[PDB]
């Protein structure tokens, strides 16, 4: 190709104006095969310039000067200057050195993490460049490990500046796009490390129904298999492939009962102790792998071994899939050691994801992160977080930052996994976040005390949790459409603010704030409430424009940074003027696709929403106050329109238009009602409540209402009253 | 010592006195150069105020009106007139809110919560404006005292406070723009009426004298050492004081014992953000609560 | 030297750069032709306009093809080049390892403005004599970030006046000028007094300078150079000899507001000592806490 340049023992491939592959080969042979990370090096031709001399070469694109002075790659021989001024003297890459600016990526797991842990770098940098080293093995055409690359150094220089979305799109072109998820993955999951019977598990699923809590997924954790019943001469019961017949005397019948309730079923698999002589599948595996059964030779875990993988999928997983298991929860915690040098977690995710496609279309796994490119094997499983406010306060930042290495389907244990402390408010705040996260999977530890069942908690917490769990199912149309946009266009569901606002310093100063699809901006509360206010809070950055609370219609004039206060039952979620959000009207109704959509419209601007579905596309347009709905294919779907406060159209079939210029634009939300509510719940003196209500009612000029609250001895009460005054300005 | 002298100068009588200690002299030059110069300035101000004091004295004797009134004499139905114990009217033209608490070392400024009655008020010294009615924490360096005059206020000052003479040979008429006003200067052997009506300033006296009148309209000396009765039209003259938000902001940030990165960010953000409500929202996020209140006073005056 | 620069056309001609592709003359002090173009075609025109000497402000690492630190190449070659136009000329640059005392002056760079930074700096300065690097120039009052305190600025200037070099410098803040009249009348007058004292001391400094050059004696010595067997000479980190006639104990802690005075524990060697400014006497040998108003600095001279 003209986009390929050799010089000395190096090869440079200009993939885009902003993406250069850099290779070294001692043998003069360079690597064309795919790697664990890289699936495609076919990119459209681009323009660039070369200055080639006897001893040096310079490659010049629109955004980078790449220099190579010959010899072995060192910090002195291989380096690059970006054509940006984001920093005064951090604009140079040196081979093998770190520079400032990296916005980070993700890490394998949150196992045993109480609050923050270090993250690996991603491809995004405030200074406009990042290097992604390809240290993986080569693949065969069909995707097996083939051994060591002939490019003994193989790097990708990203020089996208602050065009983060294009960097991620081209990363997906290089490493392969995320596959489409199935719609069932986006609903509520039930999980608990608890020794249920068939009977008690079905009773709990029927209790969810009775309690008006929708579920898509039934997880069965490790007590599905033999645990205490494993003879100690075999080691532990952690690994198992044999049903506990006391708890599950007829597994296929039990899975049939979950399938009748329209649940997908996954089992915990701890693979590390392989298939030992006590297991139900051992006689078949022993025959296939020529094991010495009289010496009870174990089929040890070896995902480098083709015969072991086949016996694992066909003879261990196969019989359980035949009983009705839909997909695998790969729960690997036993290290990164293999003879090949390939991480066993990568071998599991790669081969299990491929194998899951045999029995179900667009099937998933649930497994820990296995390095760049492992987004090809959703879903991410973050693991055994400590139950704490600190863990919750880390998790929104963790989730949005992961988009910077393309790993956009993290499933966290909602409410935290293990250890830590009881606080029903922490559980409720964690579920609020979960509902506005990639995946909403309730899960917990082997404690008698850590169930995430809403009715574990008091009547107030229970009702709020049920409301949020129903909201998750209302959001499935929006989530599923965003899922198809991840798969087809390389856009993350969850974006850091700086994807949309790369030049706004405040977009880098609100770690836990994020965009959730294209219509919603989320600022989860992740700190225990101030007991004097009976409200939690978060500092929200409002970009330029008019914003509304998604739930209340409270307005906010951007651009501003403003501390916002919510009761424990309420979450800060915002939509711009012109936002259109579809909701399932019937979130409890078991049906493959919604028979009714609510179109929720935020007044004050034009807007547009495209609802992508399995077998349709539906466009909602809001232009000069006219709302139009069209679809590619006709259906019997009934549309409901909510314009600000008011239901305008109820259950209307087919394509249509309706003029909303005549209809009431304003939400009900008002300063006086909100003021009364905040004062009434506050654990402060009644004389202070009386004086604030009287003075804020009497004082007419906005600037003098603000001067009055500025005198308040309660600093946080000032900020809460200021939020109401700012919204009422 | 300096705050006490500020109060004394705006009290009925300004008598420096002390104990038998070798260490308690009230001589200004007992203190460092900054304290000394401020004390000398306030002591000279007391003599500038003698015409105003002496006129108020004759009003106490003849009309039974106190020089120093609690706020509630003028504002009996305003609850805030009973909630500012140390605030008072000083004659009929000036409202005083002495600072009587040690300065906040992070701000290098003392403070007092001032109740501003309905109307437009000016700092007597700086011309900083305040829109009543409002209760507002005000901040001053140790060398500056909160004293306020309404739009239309006329205050006579002795131009020659050091000059030994039984009655001033020269009066400065200090006029606060924005309203009509009137002041009657009662003296041992005269009465002099200053009127400010529809922008015309008139001075008349019962008895003629060789006294020379100086007129200061807001910022600017209009008339210098003019003899006799006269009128002059000030409708054409600049009403506005120099006081401005940006200069005052820079000064408060510059003296503050806070981080330079905080000074840089406040100066930059308050300069860049155009909408008053968003400038107030920016200062509301500040981790320093008292710095919020100081910045809020400047924003309120600059609204 | 990038393609927008005024000297670029000359440098491009000399180094055979591709001007239509705007090829930069990248920094390469390993390269004889680059060094010549840098001194002759980049610095040369600015020297012709009257620039006397170069402030080399290098912060971009230790990487070169040779393995020689670029800061060492700059200090070595720039110091040599500075001698062409002026006798006994200087540079101003960061420390480049043992032997780099051959290229004065030392430039310590972007200190944080704090009491902690000031409290480190006398110890830092005297200890540097132990690797022969005796001409450190610190930013007097601190460089950047940190906190405002006019007393910190005044104490820092007191130290600076009794340091190898007295260079006032500051950050890009609107709020960090070291102008004496930035501060109140008391601080301003004290800063002016100390700045005048620096010029009164130039004869003493210049004589000590010729003694560094000819006899290998540092201007600033740790106490233990003169008193190697006295344990107290190792226990007063910020105390030092300043030439052969003066012993300095800078105050580097905020004053005690109850006393309106700062303090430092001074070790007085055997002998009769006088405060340089007041004549207050002290009988050595003794360790004694001494107190000074913010306008006064502990500096001592022996009888004789
Ligand atoms: O010759 C100038 C100066 O250089 C050296 O010291 C530097 C020091 O003064 C300071 O300078 C910074 C600048 O680097 C520039 O930084 C910005 C930063 O403020 C922020 O806006 O974010 C951008 C983007 O990330 C930065 O690039 O401007 C600011 C003022 O706002 C200056 O403070 O910091 C750097 C880094 O530590 C120093 O290199 C030199 O030592 C000094 O003597 C000299 O005066």
mmCIF file of C-alpha atoms in Angstrom, chain B residues 59-187:
data_model
loop_
_atom_site.group_PDB
_atom_site.id
_atom_site.type_symbol
_atom_site.label_atom_id
_atom_site.label_comp_id
_atom_site.label_asym_id
_atom_site.label_seq_id
_atom_site.Cartn_x
_atom_site.Cartn_y
_atom_site.Cartn_z
ATOM 1 C CA UNK B 59 -30.417 70.500 67.508
ATOM 2 C CA UNK B 60 -30.079 68.364 70.710
ATOM 3 C CA UNK B 61 -30.307 71.587 72.852
ATOM 4 C CA UNK B 62 -33.199 73.245 70.924
ATOM 5 C CA UNK B 63 -35.256 70.302 69.458
ATOM 6 C CA UNK B 64 -34.507 67.322 71.783
ATOM 7 C CA UNK B 65 -33.039 65.147 68.981
ATOM 8 C CA UNK B 66 -30.078 62.866 69.890
ATOM 9 C CA UNK B 67 -26.911 62.979 67.702
ATOM 10 C CA UNK B 68 -26.748 59.148 67.998
ATOM 11 C CA UNK B 69 -30.053 57.322 67.376
ATOM 12 C CA UNK B 70 -30.823 53.617 67.369
ATOM 13 C CA UNK B 71 -32.124 52.513 63.927
ATOM 14 C CA UNK B 72 -35.650 52.055 65.411
ATOM 15 C CA UNK B 73 -36.032 55.876 65.996
ATOM 16 C CA UNK B 74 -36.170 56.355 62.181
ATOM 17 C CA UNK B 75 -37.543 52.823 61.331
ATOM 18 C CA UNK B 76 -39.808 51.803 64.283
ATOM 19 C CA UNK B 77 -41.876 49.242 62.277
ATOM 20 C CA UNK B 78 -38.878 47.476 60.569
ATOM 21 C CA UNK B 79 -37.926 44.306 62.530
ATOM 22 C CA UNK B 80 -34.325 44.617 61.142
ATOM 23 C CA UNK B 81 -34.026 48.037 62.953
ATOM 24 C CA UNK B 82 -34.048 46.016 66.253
ATOM 25 C CA UNK B 83 -31.536 43.336 65.031
ATOM 26 C CA UNK B 84 -28.406 45.495 64.361
ATOM 27 C CA UNK B 85 -27.412 46.483 67.953
ATOM 28 C CA UNK B 86 -24.224 48.391 66.941
ATOM 29 C CA UNK B 87 -25.689 50.204 63.881
ATOM 30 C CA UNK B 88 -26.924 53.780 64.362
ATOM 31 C CA UNK B 89 -27.861 57.072 62.761
ATOM 32 C CA UNK B 90 -25.188 59.770 63.323
ATOM 33 C CA UNK B 91 -26.967 63.119 62.862
ATOM 34 C CA UNK B 92 -29.529 63.096 60.029
ATOM 35 C CA UNK B 93 -27.239 62.417 56.999
ATOM 36 C CA UNK B 94 -25.013 59.402 58.034
ATOM 37 C CA UNK B 95 -25.618 55.764 59.083
ATOM 38 C CA UNK B 96 -22.707 54.032 60.881
ATOM 39 C CA UNK B 97 -21.989 50.261 61.202
ATOM 40 C CA UNK B 98 -18.709 50.058 63.146
ATOM 41 C CA UNK B 99 -16.592 46.891 62.845
ATOM 42 C CA UNK B 100 -16.046 45.571 66.409
ATOM 43 C CA UNK B 101 -14.616 42.058 65.703
ATOM 44 C CA UNK B 102 -11.006 41.061 64.888
ATOM 45 C CA UNK B 103 -10.387 40.631 61.146
ATOM 46 C CA UNK B 104 -10.565 37.231 59.407
ATOM 47 C CA UNK B 105 -6.839 36.663 58.612
ATOM 48 C CA UNK B 106 -7.737 34.678 55.430
ATOM 49 C CA UNK B 107 -9.501 37.835 54.078
ATOM 50 C CA UNK B 108 -7.297 40.480 55.801
ATOM 51 C CA UNK B 109 -10.715 42.185 56.400
ATOM 52 C CA UNK B 110 -13.163 42.679 59.282
ATOM 53 C CA UNK B 111 -16.923 42.584 58.743
ATOM 54 C CA UNK B 112 -20.354 43.557 60.115
ATOM 55 C CA UNK B 113 -23.880 42.652 58.947
ATOM 56 C CA UNK B 114 -25.458 45.955 57.796
ATOM 57 C CA UNK B 115 -29.191 46.526 57.447
ATOM 58 C CA UNK B 116 -29.765 48.921 54.530
ATOM 59 C CA UNK B 117 -33.168 50.643 54.762
ATOM 60 C CA UNK B 118 -35.245 51.224 51.586
ATOM 61 C CA UNK B 119 -33.370 53.615 49.245
ATOM 62 C CA UNK B 120 -29.979 53.948 47.500
ATOM 63 C CA UNK B 121 -27.015 54.118 49.934
ATOM 64 C CA UNK B 122 -23.343 54.987 49.304
ATOM 65 C CA UNK B 123 -20.267 54.264 51.372
ATOM 66 C CA UNK B 124 -19.355 57.744 52.711
ATOM 67 C CA UNK B 125 -15.635 57.148 51.899
ATOM 68 C CA UNK B 126 -15.591 55.050 48.660
ATOM 69 C CA UNK B 127 -18.978 55.699 47.000
ATOM 70 C CA UNK B 128 -19.620 51.927 46.877
ATOM 71 C CA UNK B 129 -23.401 51.698 46.247
ATOM 72 C CA UNK B 130 -26.063 49.540 47.961
ATOM 73 C CA UNK B 131 -29.730 49.058 46.991
ATOM 74 C CA UNK B 132 -31.945 48.831 50.124
ATOM 75 C CA UNK B 133 -33.854 47.233 51.628
ATOM 76 C CA UNK B 134 -31.389 44.352 52.355
ATOM 77 C CA UNK B 135 -29.288 42.824 55.162
ATOM 78 C CA UNK B 136 -25.787 42.317 53.792
ATOM 79 C CA UNK B 137 -22.441 41.368 55.397
ATOM 80 C CA UNK B 138 -19.896 44.108 54.524
ATOM 81 C CA UNK B 139 -16.093 43.688 54.668
ATOM 82 C CA UNK B 140 -13.506 46.451 55.243
ATOM 83 C CA UNK B 141 -9.708 46.466 55.669
ATOM 84 C CA UNK B 142 -8.634 47.515 59.186
ATOM 85 C CA UNK B 143 -8.020 51.095 57.872
ATOM 86 C CA UNK B 144 -11.629 51.513 56.559
ATOM 87 C CA UNK B 145 -14.964 51.981 58.415
ATOM 88 C CA UNK B 146 -18.555 51.240 57.197
ATOM 89 C CA UNK B 147 -20.295 54.669 57.088
ATOM 90 C CA UNK B 148 -23.122 55.270 54.638
ATOM 91 C CA UNK B 149 -25.089 58.210 53.175
ATOM 92 C CA UNK B 150 -28.376 58.120 51.173
ATOM 93 C CA UNK B 151 -28.776 59.501 47.623
ATOM 94 C CA UNK B 152 -29.356 63.270 48.201
ATOM 95 C CA UNK B 153 -27.222 63.415 51.389
ATOM 96 C CA UNK B 154 -25.355 66.743 51.960
ATOM 97 C CA UNK B 155 -22.544 66.675 54.556
ATOM 98 C CA UNK B 156 -20.519 69.785 55.384
ATOM 99 C CA UNK B 157 -16.822 69.281 56.255
ATOM 100 C CA UNK B 158 -14.181 71.702 57.551
ATOM 101 C CA UNK B 159 -11.671 72.034 54.643
ATOM 102 C CA UNK B 160 -8.935 73.138 57.093
ATOM 103 C CA UNK B 161 -9.272 70.812 60.123
ATOM 104 C CA UNK B 162 -5.654 71.568 61.305
ATOM 105 C CA UNK B 163 -6.214 75.373 61.114
ATOM 106 C CA UNK B 164 -6.727 77.031 64.521
ATOM 107 C CA UNK B 165 -9.801 79.285 64.006
ATOM 108 C CA UNK B 166 -13.007 79.626 66.116
ATOM 109 C CA UNK B 167 -15.227 78.781 63.057
ATOM 110 C CA UNK B 168 -14.221 77.320 59.674
ATOM 111 C CA UNK B 169 -13.063 79.893 57.049
ATOM 112 C CA UNK B 170 -13.861 77.153 54.434
ATOM 113 C CA UNK B 171 -16.622 74.454 54.242
ATOM 114 C CA UNK B 172 -16.661 71.502 51.792
ATOM 115 C CA UNK B 173 -20.254 70.616 50.800
ATOM 116 C CA UNK B 174 -20.131 66.877 50.053
ATOM 117 C CA UNK B 175 -23.165 65.886 47.959
ATOM 118 C CA UNK B 176 -24.345 62.316 47.255
ATOM 119 C CA UNK B 177 -26.138 62.234 43.849
ATOM 120 C CA UNK B 178 -29.456 60.596 42.869
ATOM 121 C CA UNK B 179 -32.107 62.511 44.948
ATOM 122 C CA UNK B 180 -33.028 65.943 46.386
ATOM 123 C CA UNK B 181 -31.546 66.871 49.770
ATOM 124 C CA UNK B 182 -31.107 69.633 52.299
ATOM 125 C CA UNK B 183 -28.752 70.476 55.181
ATOM 126 C CA UNK B 184 -29.005 73.348 57.710
ATOM 127 C CA UNK B 185 -25.558 74.267 59.238
ATOM 128 C CA UNK B 186 -26.315 75.909 62.633
ATOM 129 C CA UNK B 187 -23.354 77.928 64.037
#
